[PDB]
């Protein structure tokens, strides 16, 4: 997780063989690429959607 958060968009945890496991906050789900976080509800926290 050492450099650039393990490429996790939100949260990183270290795992054996020096791999990482990414995760996301409530309202998001870990995307297919196992790094990015995508919305899982209509108005997830912390996002500007009026724009």
């Amino acid at each position: 997780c050492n450099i650039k958060n393990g490429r996790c968009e939100q949260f990183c945890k270290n795992s054996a063989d020096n791999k990482v496991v990414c995760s996301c906050t409530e309202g998001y789900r870990l995307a297919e690429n196992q790094k990015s976080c995508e919305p899982a509800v209509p108005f997830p926290c912390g996002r500007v959607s009026v724009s």
Binding site: Q10, T25, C37, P44, C45, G46, V50
Partner: protein, 235 residues
């Protein structure tokens, strides 16, 4: 907020204003549809408070405002254990009826303790509110916001005769001119992480506003996230 700029509608959709025996006396942030986090010094009395989410201009109607009554107030249990220290300046407000989430009414994200501190230490956060726009001056009509730099602990200690506890941080500019201010207390200090905003502080206290050599003092939210999550559970 002194030296800030007008927000656009929906730019800080977690921001709320508190109204009571004074209009627009403090801010807060949406934790979820039933719960607001604010400063304990905003709500010491138990007197009646209302919350307005989806607010932008407090003298106009936007048709985005959602007004709620506060039915429960939970100051942190260690607030006012010592007199006039402003330690543990954080409180939670339960709403009578759930907010309806939409583009103007959206929660702020709250990470675990480790990552809230990581986000703070990135070192640049946004504060917002309808507080004073000059020291001893009038309150804002349009929601204000300001980017403030994190200030090193040693510098902050030297800036004031007060104690800066571990549960606090300092933010602002070495030359002054830009700061949160009276009326902004309880509103968010937030850190944007790849387009997603996380709560990193609560606007708490200072000495006057925007004076050179002084900094805004903020409650360090990382130390309180377990308590926030415990108390604001929905079921």
């Amino acid at each position: 907020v002194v030296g800030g700029e007008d927000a656009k509608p929906g730019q800080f959709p977690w921001q709320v204003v508190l109204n009571g025996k004074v209009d627009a006396f403090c801010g807060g942030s949406i934790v979820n549809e039933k719960w607001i986090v604010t400063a304990a010094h905003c709500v010491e009395t138990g007197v009646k408070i209302t919350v307005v989410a989806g607010e932008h201009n407090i003298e106009e109607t936007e048709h985005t405002e959602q007004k709620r009554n506060v039915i429960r107030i939970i100051p942190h249990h260690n607030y006012n254990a010592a007199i006039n220290t402003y330690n543990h300046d954080i409180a939670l407000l339960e709403l009578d009826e759930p907010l309806v989430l939409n583009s103007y009414v959206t929660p702020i994200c709250i990470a675990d303790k480790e990552y809230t501190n990581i986000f703070l230490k990135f070192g640049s956060g946004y504060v917002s509110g309808w507080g004073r726009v000059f020291h001893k001056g009038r309150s804002a009509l349009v929601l204000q916001y300001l980017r403030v730099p994190l200030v090193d602990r040693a510098t902050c200690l030297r800036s004031t005769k007060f104690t800066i506890y571990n549960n606090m941080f300092c933010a602002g500019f070495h030359e002054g001119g830009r700061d949160s201010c009276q009326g902004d207390s309880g509103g968010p200090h937030v850190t944007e992480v790849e387009g997603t905003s996380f709560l990193t502080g609560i606007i708490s206290w200072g000495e006057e506003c925007a004076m050179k050599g002084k900094y805004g003092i903020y409650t360090k939210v990382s130390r309180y996230v377990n308590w926030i999550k415990e108390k604001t559970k929905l079921t």
